């Protein structure tokens, strides 16, 4: 089997991407944030505290003939941005882009933090990291990809995120029309539950490539590119007037600037992030100070190849017995 679904930016900045997902019988379609940095599929639901729902579409398990309470199971998750959610668990039929999993754990939110409430466009998350990170207790549950894997034509999914435009998540096949040149594959460590890999270096603009190992995670659920302070300083030093602002919470730059590209290495291959991808617009409405798309990972504890980086590439998440990651230009 295979699946193919379009993923759409939630706003004009590509803060996140939503992908329609069919849950239950008859189908209830919710727009979920596919997140390769976590491993829970959770939804706003009929059980979510009413004051914490503000415009989201909810899953109502009582209206699904295939929903079954997973008795005794609870979940609770905290994300890198400080947001969180928790609740109980049902199993139900879940389909993405024509690919159907029966008996998928669907984690029903009883509580969500303010960041989720305030984002009317995201109806929940669909985790695509390794199932070892799943938070269901006392019986850990598998991700949608893990459940689908044996039935897929090939044990892979691909992320093809757009810049200010829709893109695609495919399951079970590599669309050879979706990228240019060849795909370069690189080793993955699953030791922390992430799609963790090591970039071979970077360049700023038309500058020379610096060969240096940068361990980080491929994370579709993080907006920006978070890299070591040395790398980030070298980037922003090429933008007149850019500075790190503790009050704003990262590097800012004059909105009048033209940003340089940023290149990252994948083995001997190179992925180029155009300068425009690094512009996250005015810090506040009407400001002439703009927020940068490359930020320091210092104090996160991990480097994160978030959407800013991933949307510059066609990315293969290879879930073979020894997982790997592939990157192509597009």
Tell me, yes or no, whether 154 and 32 share the same domain.
Answer: yes
Cα separation, 21 vs 32, in Å, equals: 7
DSSP 137: B
Tell me, yes or no, whether 220 and 152 share the same domain.
Answer: no
Cα separation, 13 vs 161, in Å, equals: 13
Tell me the resolution in Å.
Answer: 1.4
Tell me, yes or no, whether 257 and 225 share the same domain.
Answer: yes
Tell me, yes or no, whether 276 and 197 share the same domain.
Answer: yes
Q: Which two tokens stand for residue 257?
A: 């600037």
Residues identified as active-site = 35, 199
Q: How much helix, strand and coil, in percent to the nearest 5, is found in the chain? A: 10, 45, 45
CA-nearest of 196, 185, 243 to 219 is 196
Tell me, yes or no, whether 287 and 154 share the same domain.
Answer: no
Tell me, yes or no, whether 220 and 91 share the same domain.
Answer: no
Q: Which residues pair with 182 in a beta bridge?
A: none
Tell me, yes or no, whether 101 and 189 share the same domain.
Answer: no
Q: Which two tokens stand for residue 95?
A: 């389909």
Chosen domain end from 141, 174, 207 = 174
Q: Rounded to the nearest 5 degrees, what angle is found at the Cα of 11, between the Cα atoms of 303 and 293? A: 30
Tell me, yes or no, whether 291 and 227 share the same domain.
Answer: yes
Q: Which residues pair with 6 in a beta bridge?
A: 168
Cα separation, 109 vs 58, in Å, equals: 10
Query: What is the span of the domain harbouring residue 52?
Result: 5-174
CA-nearest of 61, 51, 118, 109 to 85 is 109
Please, are residues 143 and 132 in contact by the beta-carbon 8 Å criterion? no
C-alpha distances in Å from residue 13, one per residue of 95, 196, 227, 277 = 28, 26, 20, 9
Tell me, yes or no, whether 33 and 101 share the same domain.
Answer: yes
How many independent structural domains does the chain possess?
2
Q: Answer whether the bond into residue 26 is a cis peptide, omega within 30°.
A: yes
Q: What does residue 255 show for φ and ψ, rounded to 5 degrees?
A: -65, -20
Tell me, yes or no, whether 273 and 217 share the same domain.
Answer: yes
Half-sphere exposure of 11 (CA within 13 A, CB side): 10
Please, are residues 264 and 197 in contact by the beta-carbon 8 Å criterion? no
Tell me, yes or no, whether 85 and 15 share the same domain.
Answer: yes
Cα separation, 90 vs 249, in Å, equals: 38
Q: Domain holding 282: CATH number?
A: 2.40.70.10
Chosen domain end from 174, 200, 233 = 174
Residue with tokens 């024509």: 98
Tell me, yes or no, whether 138 and 16 share the same domain.
Answer: yes
> For residue 139, how far is the Cα from the chain centroid?
25
- DSSP string of 240-273? TT-EEETTTTEEEEETTPPPPPEEEEETTEEEEE
């Amino acid at each position: 089997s295979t699946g193919s679904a379009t993923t759409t930016p939630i706003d004009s900045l590509d803060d996140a991407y939503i992908t329609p997902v069919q849950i239950g019988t008859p189908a209830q379609t919710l727009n979920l944030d596919f997140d390769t940095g976590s491993s829970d599929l959770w939804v706003f639901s009929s059980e979510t505290t009413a004051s914490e729902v503000d415009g989201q579409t909810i899953y109502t398990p009582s209206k699904s003939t295939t929903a079954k309470l997973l008795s005794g199971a609870t979940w609770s998750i905290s994300y890198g941005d400080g947001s969180s959610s928790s609740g109980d668990v049902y199993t139900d039929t879940v389909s993405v882009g024509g690919l159907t999993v029966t008996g998928q754990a669907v984690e029903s939110a009883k509580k969500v933090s303010s960041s989720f409430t305030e984002d009317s466009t995201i109806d929940g998350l669909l985790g695509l990291a390794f199932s070892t990170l799943n938070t269901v207790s006392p019986t850990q549950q598998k991700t949608f990809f893990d459940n689908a894997k044996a039935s897929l034509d090939s044990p892979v999914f691909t992320a093809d995120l757009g810049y200010h435009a829709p893109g695609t998540y495919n399951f079970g096949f590599i669309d050879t029309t979706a990228y240019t040149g060849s795909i370069t594959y690189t080793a993955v460590s699953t030791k922390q539950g992430f799609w963790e890999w090591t970039s071979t270096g970077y360049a700023v603009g038309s500058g020379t490539f610096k060969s240096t190992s940068i361990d980080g995670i491929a994370d579709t659920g993080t907006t920006l590119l978070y890299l070591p302070a040395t790398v980030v300083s070298a980037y922003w030093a090429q933008v007149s007037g850019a500075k790190s602002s503790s009050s704003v919470g990262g590097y800012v730059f004059p909105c009048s600037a033209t940003l340089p590209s940023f290149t990252f290495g994948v083995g001997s291959a190179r992925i180029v992030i155009p300068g425009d991808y690094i512009d996250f617009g005015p810090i506040s409405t009407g400001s002439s100070s703009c927020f940068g798309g490359i930020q320091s990972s210092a104090g996160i504890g991990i480097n994160i190849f978030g959407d800013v980086a991933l949307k510059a590439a066609f990315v293969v998440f290879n879930g073979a017995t020894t997982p790997t990651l592939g990157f192509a230009s597009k």
